[PDB]
Amino acid sequence: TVPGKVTLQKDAQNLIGISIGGGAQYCPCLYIVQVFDNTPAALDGTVAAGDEITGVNGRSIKGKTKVEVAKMIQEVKGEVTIHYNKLQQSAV
Amino acid sequence: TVPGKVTLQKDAQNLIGISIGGGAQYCPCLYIVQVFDNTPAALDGTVAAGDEITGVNGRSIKGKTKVEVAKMIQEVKGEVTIHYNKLQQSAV
């Protein structure tokens, strides 16, 4: 677990270019599921598939659904600071 | 949000071509993070990045580390059955 944050410029459609997963009844943690090609997320290159989302613009995501965190990100315009954890996976 | 199970054939390196996340303290649930190209999991089409792993060959991974989860897939030769939830994610 190496912690961080990064600020991504929204594109013209007010998207940074990620899907967020988790935040379900028994799975409190929130994760970046895909980084879509050719989006600001994709081009900065800090975050990746599998990284955990700990915060948006200086605010926890603790106990929120993926929708609520998706809203937290839409509502921010122009740029957005995604708090994360780079995480390991086990290949199989 | 849909439970299922897929039996897959191990390759010659006794692998199926997925990655595993979560399975950690404060982050109980376990996820498929990458599906690797030209591998059985990818060639099979059933599973995608972001789906929950919930069981293997009839056993529940409940409460295990991703290290342990990988152990359990690597143990079974020839083919392994993976129990999973197809999940969704909010795009931003």
Range of the domain at B22: 1-92
- Residues contacting A48, CB < 8 A, separation 6+: A32, A35, A86
Contact between residue B82 and residue A8 where contact means Cβ atoms under 8 Å apart = no
Per-residue tokens: B3: 């439970």
d(CA A54, nearest CA chain B) in Å:
12
Q: Which residue spans within B1-91 are E strands per DSSP?
A: 2-9, 18-24, 27-35, 52-56, 59-60, 79-86, 90-91
CATH number for the domain harbouring residue B58:
2.30.42.10
The total of structural domains in chain B comes to 1
Contact between residue B9 and residue B76 where contact means Cβ atoms under 8 Å apart = no
Q: Please state, in angstroms and rounded to a whole number, the distance separating the CA atoms of residues A88 and A72.
A: 26
- At what resolution in Å was this solved? 2.4
Per-residue tokens: B45: 């089409």
Per-residue tokens: A28: 């409190």
Select from A37, A49, A34 the least CA-distant residue to A91: A49
Q: Please state, in angstroms and rounded to a whole number, the distance separating the CA atoms of residues A52 and A84.
A: 5
For residue A27, say whether it is annotated as part of any ligand binding site. yes
Q: Do A31 and B31 touch (CB under 8 A)?
A: yes
The structure tokens 């315009």 sit at A77
Burial class (CB in 10 A: 0-12, 13-18, 19+), A16: buried
